[PDB]
Amino acid sequence: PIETVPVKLKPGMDGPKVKQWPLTEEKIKALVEICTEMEKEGKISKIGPENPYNTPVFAIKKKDSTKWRKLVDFRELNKRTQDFWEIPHPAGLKKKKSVTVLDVGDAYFSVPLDEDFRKYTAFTIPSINNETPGIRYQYNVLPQGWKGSPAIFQSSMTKILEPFKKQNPDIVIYQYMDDLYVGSDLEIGQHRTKIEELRQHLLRWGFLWMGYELHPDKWTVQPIVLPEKDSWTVNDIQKLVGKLNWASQIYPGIKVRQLSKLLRGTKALTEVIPLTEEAELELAENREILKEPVHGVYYDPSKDLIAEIQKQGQGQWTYQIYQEPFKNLKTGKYARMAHTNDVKQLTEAVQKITTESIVIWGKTPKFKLPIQKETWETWWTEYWQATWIPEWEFVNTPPLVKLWYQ
Amino acid sequence: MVPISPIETVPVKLKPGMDGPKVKQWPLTEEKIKALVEICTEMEKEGKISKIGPENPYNTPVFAIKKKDSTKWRKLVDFRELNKRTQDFWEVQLGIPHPAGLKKKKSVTVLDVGDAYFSVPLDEDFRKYTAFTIPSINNETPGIRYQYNVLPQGWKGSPAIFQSSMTKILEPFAAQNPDIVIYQYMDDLYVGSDLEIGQHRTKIEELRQHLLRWGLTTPDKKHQKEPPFLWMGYELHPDKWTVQPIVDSWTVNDIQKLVGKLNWASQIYPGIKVRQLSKLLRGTLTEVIPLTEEAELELAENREILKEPVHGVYYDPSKDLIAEIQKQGQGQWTYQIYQEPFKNLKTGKYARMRGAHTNDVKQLTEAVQKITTESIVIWGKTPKFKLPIQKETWETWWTEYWQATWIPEWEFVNTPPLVKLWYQLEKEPIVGAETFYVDGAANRETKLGKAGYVTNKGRQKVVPLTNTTNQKTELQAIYLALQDSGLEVNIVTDSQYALGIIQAQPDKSESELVNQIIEQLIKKEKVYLAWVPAHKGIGGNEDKLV
Ligand SMILES: C=CC(=O)N(C)CCOc1cc(Cl)ccc1Oc1cc(Cl)cc(C#N)c1
């Protein structure tokens, strides 16, 4: 065990030097209490000015607990960490009727780290108003949030649950960062039980008490639906034509001209138009096209997953995951009943989408958030609750395609 | 002799691949050579330096500088080449405390510790790359070589290493004197205690001994520097703080540096305006650019504003913390942060970003986040806001805005000009309103095109236009329908561009066509704007492309 698995960066890169950002006084207090046992347990140790490396750090509440937990934004070290090429995605996991997420990075801390690399895991607890220099630190053990911390423990971990999953050759087990995704075809009771069993089985070799329940969705890509009316106003047809024209980029074979013929003429917008026999037929063929899924849409593990999110109003949010535009791998809608805080809702939605994305492909996506950078930058860490963090960017033009995903 | 505890060296290396420095010792004057030997012999006496033999290939130059009228000379070493090759360090003084962030204390002592710079060892392994040679007289004797045993004055490593060690010593003293508060900026210490000036005065003693236990010199008499402390361009007083008053051919320097100067004054001076001059900087380095007889209008409330001297107070953690915002016009916002009325902790302004269009409600939101971020820096909490916007206005805005958005806890303050929503598009077609199908088009060569509409009542118009583009004409066509329609109107466009502009709800724009539409929307009761795909022969989709 004493051997520390050697690690390096990818050729020709320096370790992270990222500004720590301001933290509120109560989160500073919490990281103080937290980071005082982490030294007393040798998990971290103080450093001096010889170390210029720096990785941001802050504090969260995880689910249904008032105990502050600490996160490090390993995003710049994780893209500078060696490939760690030294785990074909469990496609069984995305089909299981239930899947529970278990926190396992609570025990990454029992293994040391190559003395040469700790310098790259450097962070600062910050002080209010710059009154004191920051409390700097470095990791001695394997840190939660590091891209190498599952890779290094993947050997020890397979021997951990080797008794399990030889008893239960159906329950699919997956692992991403500090999370263990265990999925079952068993019914809710049978899953809720085999869960508690795999819990204590972790204790013998050991925030493990927390877990999530998540079940699959009927449609990976939800269908595009056209209205079913007995009378159509000009406005109704105008929206219909606009939506079928948009769907023509995804589903070629969509024809609109017989519907457009009913529009010619300067009729008032609220006037009912009777549909012609031609137009009624064209609407019918157009449905049949939309009943089939989009054809020849394949995932590509080399490529990046893009996620787009629209705010719909009334706590509803629609999203789409794709690599190439108009070829969605998944599409979905998250709703509610906050309802005062748009940003709270958005950051949960980004969280749900990322977790789904870990269950399906085992890699998180890149978001295009309908939010202003400075606003999102200010508040997201107040609602974030996952031990990982995707990448993101910001959408500053109102896409007119929001209602078409309504 | 009482043994001084030793100061652990800091492991220091150079940049990888770069071996180190070698610099030609400059030809000096015999006076300068006679002077420099005196210092080094006295420095060697102290242990600050040591002679080095013929095994060191790294040379750092050393010249001499007389102390102005003072007859005593002073030696300088240019490690500028050792610095270009020295390793990287963690700097921590990347930001200056803000006076408004300090808690009021009965007593406050300032101790200079810049002396101990040289009381701090050096990594013996690195004492070599710092090495200098003193030119012998007449170049007839082998030159004298020397190295440093302590952090040299010009070495890039010396600040960061001093501060790290200096912190390490102080941690036990502060843990055992919780009744005091120590702050360390850069070679300075700032002790503050709500204690009887007698008890406080002796805990300053204890501290100097603690630092002496490690061999750190520090002043006892003539260290008071009693308030007013002159510090980082402020004047701090026991109950109040302020800024040290700092200073035809309006040279670009009268603009390039005066920008940050007037901004500096506006952390406590309310209503300091610095925008018209920022336009004068343009994208320029030497020019007496005009005052536009409009930028000088701010000086009549700027130079007249620095007359009545303004003070801020220190922070009290027990009261609430409150920020209030005023719209100043021209994308300008001011705020005050305070705990009791008119006793400001500090003030500020918010500069609008470079938008093509924009509205007040977005400008306000950004000002809120900026104040939010600054307050967390300075106090570790967000203030409660007083904002000139009705709650109704805020609800309608955020609930119908297509982006996510949020303001922390806040209240309506009814100082005008209030921030309002100027117009509001309908969600559904308006029964009984005339329907204008508008269209516009231009020719990429001639810059010539038409703009007009056709309606369900047979109303029609086409205007021809010179020197124009498809985007201008699509907008003009909407503008035509707004002028010629009544108080309630349904508009159909094929312009995705025109929609994008209006679905962002500007209330001011750089394009004067956009402002005329906006001004038309304001006079309307109900406007429904509907998009359709172009070239699908839809209803009255055009006449405007001839
Ligand atoms: C009653 C006097 C008075 O000046 N105050 C109450 C202001 C609060 O000053 C301190 C509050 C505390 Cl808690 C510790 C140290 C403080 O003195 C500082 C802090 C700094 Cl950054 C710089 C300097 C300098 N020069 C002094």
CSV table of C-alpha atoms and ligand atoms in Angstrom, one decimal, chain B residues 97 102-106 108 110 181 183 190-192 229 231 236-238 314, ligand 1:
chain,number,residue,atom,x,y,z
B,97,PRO,CA,-7.7,46.0,2.4
B,102,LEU,CA,-12.0,47.4,9.2
B,103,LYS,CA,-13.9,47.1,12.5
B,104,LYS,CA,-13.6,50.0,14.8
B,105,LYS,CA,-11.2,49.4,17.7
B,106,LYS,CA,-10.4,51.4,20.8
B,108,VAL,CA,-4.6,50.4,17.0
B,110,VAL,CA,1.3,50.0,13.6
B,181,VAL,CA,-6.5,41.3,16.1
B,183,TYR,CA,-3.2,42.1,10.3
B,190,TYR,CA,-1.4,46.3,12.4
B,191,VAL,CA,-2.5,45.4,15.9
B,192,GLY,CA,-5.9,46.4,17.1
B,229,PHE,CA,-2.1,56.9,9.6
B,231,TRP,CA,-1.6,54.5,4.3
B,236,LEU,CA,-7.4,56.6,8.6
B,237,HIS,CA,-8.6,58.3,11.8
B,238,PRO,CA,-9.9,56.4,14.9
B,314,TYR,CA,-15.6,51.8,9.8
C,1,LIG,C1,-9.1,53.5,16.3
C,1,LIG,C2,-8.2,53.5,15.3
C,1,LIG,C3,-8.4,52.9,13.9
C,1,LIG,O1,-7.6,53.1,13.1
C,1,LIG,N1,-9.4,51.9,13.5
C,1,LIG,C4,-10.5,51.4,14.4
C,1,LIG,C5,-9.4,51.4,12.2
C,1,LIG,C6,-9.4,49.9,12.3
C,1,LIG,O2,-8.1,49.5,12.2
C,1,LIG,C7,-7.8,48.2,12.6
C,1,LIG,C8,-8.8,47.3,13.0
C,1,LIG,C9,-8.3,46.0,13.3
C,1,LIG,CL1,-9.5,44.8,13.8
C,1,LIG,C10,-7.0,45.7,13.2
C,1,LIG,C11,-6.0,46.6,12.8
C,1,LIG,C12,-6.5,47.9,12.4
C,1,LIG,O3,-5.7,48.9,12.1
C,1,LIG,C13,-5.2,49.0,10.8
C,1,LIG,C14,-5.6,48.2,9.7
C,1,LIG,C15,-5.0,48.4,8.5
C,1,LIG,CL2,-5.4,47.3,7.1
C,1,LIG,C16,-4.0,49.4,8.3
C,1,LIG,C17,-3.7,50.2,9.4
C,1,LIG,C18,-2.6,51.3,9.2
C,1,LIG,N2,-1.9,52.1,9.1
C,1,LIG,C19,-4.3,50.0,10.6
